[PDB]
Amino acid sequence: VSKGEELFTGVVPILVELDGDVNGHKFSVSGEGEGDATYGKLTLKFICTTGKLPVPWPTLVTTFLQCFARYPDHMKQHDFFKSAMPEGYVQERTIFFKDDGNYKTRAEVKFEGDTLVNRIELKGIDFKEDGNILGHKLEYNGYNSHNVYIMADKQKNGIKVNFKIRHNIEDGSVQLADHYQQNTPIGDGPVLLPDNHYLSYQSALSKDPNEKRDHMVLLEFVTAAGIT
């Protein structure tokens, strides 16, 4: 196994800490769980520690650990995420909500000992007061996409990722969220610059029946594909 790959052969504990500000509405979220890349499995629970989350949990699903994706053996050489570990990488995204505002996120993903940690800062601007986001008009469910596109970015020694999410609006319509992403390694060591490929997602949202705080239980299965 590769140096980076070896860090993911078993169950890895995860910690996520996010500070956000959407149209001046400030909030913080703490998350805990575990990743089992062998099965492309993520099991997580996020808690808003500042009170009520000012945006719908579904809009934060993509922000809330691609290093846990299951890369088929024949595609191992295209797994940028694990190759950058343990020093990690910085993930940046601009998420454009159609006919509404946008989120810009900066996440530092790396190991703190044997724990995979993600420190995230989220900034949202230009949102409409009674739009689907600030007006909480989105159904509490996930989105499953087979089109999370990955390609190399030799200029930052990393990758570029793009994909679309369609959140379900309570009236039966959909709220599009266009994602543009870039990942840059934190260390100066070699990383695997991948050939074009994609990740396939299965995402499910739920609630902890005994939890009184505003929270989200998230289960995902992530698999790389596209290179035969």
Residue numbers in the entry: 1 to 64, 68 to 231
From the paper:
Fluorescent proteins share a common structure composed of an eleven-stranded β-barrel containing a chromophore that is spontaneously formed through cyclization of a tri-peptide sequence following the central α-helix. We here used yellow fluorescent protein (YFP), which is a GFP variant that has a chromophore composed of the GFP chromophore and the phenol group of Tyr203. Insertion of a few glycine residues between Asn144 and Tyr145 enhanced the pressure dependency of the fluorescent intensity of YFP.
Glycine, which has no side chain, caused a 1 nm spectral blue-shift in emission and decreased the fluorescence intensity. In the YFP-1G structure, β-strand 7 is slightly distorted, causing a small expansion of the barrel (cyan). The glycine insertion shifts β-strand 7 along the chain to the N-terminal direction for YFP-3G and the C-terminal direction for YFP-1G. The most remarkable difference is that the side chain of Tyr145 (Tyr146 for YFP-G1 and Tyr148 for YFP-G3) moved away from the neighborhood of the chromophore, producing a large space near the chromophore. While YFP did not show the pressure dependency in fluorescent intensity below 50 MPa (red), the single glycine insertion made YFP sensitive to the pressure (blue), and the further glycine insertion enhanced its pressure dependency (green). At the higher pressure, the intensity of YFP decreased with increased pressure, while that of YFP-3G increased and that of YFP-1G was biphasic.
